[PDB]
Enzyme design. Structure first.
Site, PDB file in Angstrom:
ATOM      1  CE  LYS A  47      -3.112   0.609   3.132  1.00  0.00           C
ATOM      2  NZ  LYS A  47      -3.548   1.204   4.505  1.00  0.00           N
ATOM      3  CG  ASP A 144     -13.970   2.167  10.132  1.00  0.00           C
ATOM      4  OD1 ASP A 144     -15.255   2.468   9.801  1.00  0.00           O
ATOM      5  OD2 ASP A 144     -13.034   2.381   8.894  1.00  0.00           O
TER       6      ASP A 144
END
Lengths: 374, 374
Positions: A47, A144
């Site tokens: 990433k 989350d």
């Protein structure tokens, strides 16, 4: 006019051992690429997070995301394999984060033209619950959980990631957030993660062909907040929740203290819960019960992970046999951190992967204020 | 024995031996699209599988319109129809494999990619889209459903249009209404090819989002008119509302072209001003802004035409005038409601155009004299 190179592989600058193959998709705060690591003979996800210090709220979340992953060790949690040394130790505005690869994730799964058996559904849910239990017993509330951060392999194993919003015990997607989180309560517990699990469970149930024969008809259960560009979003989200589980009962409101909150809730006209058995007709009464118990307005009425793992619905897939230290973050979670402090902690985390790294003295002067239990 | 998941769904794609299915590309109209290699012609192709064909005869006729139009359009600006695979069951087929020219990407995918475009790229794509629309209109067709998902794109910025299932001859599902001209939202019957220009303005707006100087984070790119929900009377209201939010409520002059009941409806919308496009897109010259503005006119007569757009100063440096047709005839009349048996006949006749040796069953050929008349 230059040719367009749609995947952006040219923007990805990493050391020689990593062979960038293709763009996987969007991750938290950046894009994720499939790479082969020659040094360890395995595929990895890389990433790239850009514009790191532009917004210090996001920056700290990125830091929280990597510090937690670096400290969790479990088959239920995506491994952090590497943090690449920045070209410019003083001025870096990007970071390359190297992660354990998974075959897919739940968000991607729900968009695929395949169907799941009920065994698949139970196995995925059971594995998710195991992951959450490890998270909670490590002293963390994820806060989350969503399809996008529940990674998935072919054998239905589940690996959780993206701890940037996690608590020690942009258009934002609010579709998986517990009501008490939407009602801006600062008194909330790990039971918010159970709510999110119920939301994900509902979408897993859409994977039965007998429920939905056409993959393009699969939707989240509570898509209340708009995809497009805080008070109106929270209102719309609460609204769709009440449309599904009904307005709160008097006993639900009893558990809440603040009368400003109650008054606000009363403004929402009364309605009955929808019939879940009708919505998911191929599921046993026990399965509906499990889903129902996850999606309770009152968090104290919400099923726990232990109870859920004990639930009759999951009896067939449970493996009590093949199934923890509380983690300590190198900064206290209340401290607002300056860019200079942030830069120090980032490089310390990089140094955990690369011990020969010399951290500049303008950063190391901050060293006595961090890593106090490490 | 819990089976492994296979995320692409390559397993249910059944095609003749010359086609090698490589991977899933994504969703197309009425089906999923796969990259394949044709061993016979030694080229890559896109193969779309449309299933449950006859479950909904409205969708069925749209699928037929989509293939009959493509089969009769011949242009570098239009996706080629390379093959219609012979069904295994000529009598009872409920699926069709449609083999198309492959493109590198499409505009919907482009907007989600982590790359940025130069202004030259944007001009070039827009110019090529306009050339395609002009060929379409000169062929006696209004596309009527132009959107980023059906504007295919190659690395050199060439644009290929497809998906003519809603197209009109110039004489459940959640539907994306975000690119529909207001006279379409208002269900007017007398509309013209100028509805395609409105859609082009919508697409142009998203192309402009591709400039880094406008939007530095790809996740902040959105359609211009996302009114209708992702999840028929409420939708049209919300879509019309967001249009007026952007271009303002219609002037008295705009209404002159219009039914008293419709005018009475529009008046219910509280008056508002158009937003300033120059501020929304500050990196674009007054020429570009003028082009966009003139595409997004409420009154269809006030909208720029394709000829005028190709003449526009904005596109002067990309225009290749030197490099710039018959009206197509469909084998059925647009107005007639076709039965399943008639639909099957026309499908097989279209298949037969690619496979002359196909013997259509007599039970279908009885319908011969009612079709392919012109």
């Amino acid at each position: 006019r230059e040719n367009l190179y749609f995947q952006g592989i040219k923007n990805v600058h990493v050391p020689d051992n990593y062979i960038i193959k293709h763009l996987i998709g969007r991750g938290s705060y950046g894009y994720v690429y499939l790479a082969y690591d020659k040094n360890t003979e395995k595929n990895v996800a890389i990433k790239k997070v850009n514009r790191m210090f532009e917004d210090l709220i996001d920056c700290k979340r990125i830091l929280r995301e990597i510090t937690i992953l670096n400290r969790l060790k479990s088959d239920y949690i995506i491994r952090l394999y590497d943090l690449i040394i920045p070209d410019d130790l003083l001025k870096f505005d990007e970071l390359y984060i190297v992660l354990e690869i998974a075959d897919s994730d739940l968000k991607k799964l729900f968009k695929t033209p395949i169907f799941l058996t009920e065994e698949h559904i139970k196995t995925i849910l059971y594995n998710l619950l195991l992951g959450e239990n490890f998270i909670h017993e490590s002293g963390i509330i994820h806060r989350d959980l969503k399809p996008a951060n529940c990674l998935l392999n072919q054998d239905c194993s589940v690996k959780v990631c993206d701890f940037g919003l996690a608590r020690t015990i942009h258009v934002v997607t609010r579709w998986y957030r517990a009501p008490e989180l939407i009602l801006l309560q600062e008194n909330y517990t790990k039971s918010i993660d159970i709510w999110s699990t119920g939301c994900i469970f509902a979408e897993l149930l859409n994977m039965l062909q007998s429920h939905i024969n056409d993959p393009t008809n699969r939707f989240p259960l509570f898509p209340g907040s708009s995809c497009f560009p805080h008070e109106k979003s929270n209102r719309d989200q609460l609204n769709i929740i009440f449309n599904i589980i009904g307005t709160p009962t008097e006993d639900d409101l009893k558990n809440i203290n603040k009368p400003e909150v109650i008054k606000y809730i009363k403004l929402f006209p009364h309605r009955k819960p929808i019939n879940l058995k009708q919505k998911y007709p191929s599921i046993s009464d026990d399965g509906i019960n499990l889903l129902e118990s996850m999606l309770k307005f009152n968090p104290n009425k919400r099923i726990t992970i232990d109870q859920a793992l004990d639930h009759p619905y999951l009896k067939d897939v449970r493996k009590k046999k093949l199934e923890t230290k509380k983690i300590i973050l190198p900064f206290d979670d209340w401290m607002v951190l300056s860019e200079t402090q942030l830069r120090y902690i980032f490089l310390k985390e990089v140094q955990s992967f690369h011990p020969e790294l010399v951290i500049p003295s303008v950063f190391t002067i901050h060293e006595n204020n961090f890593y106090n239990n490490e």
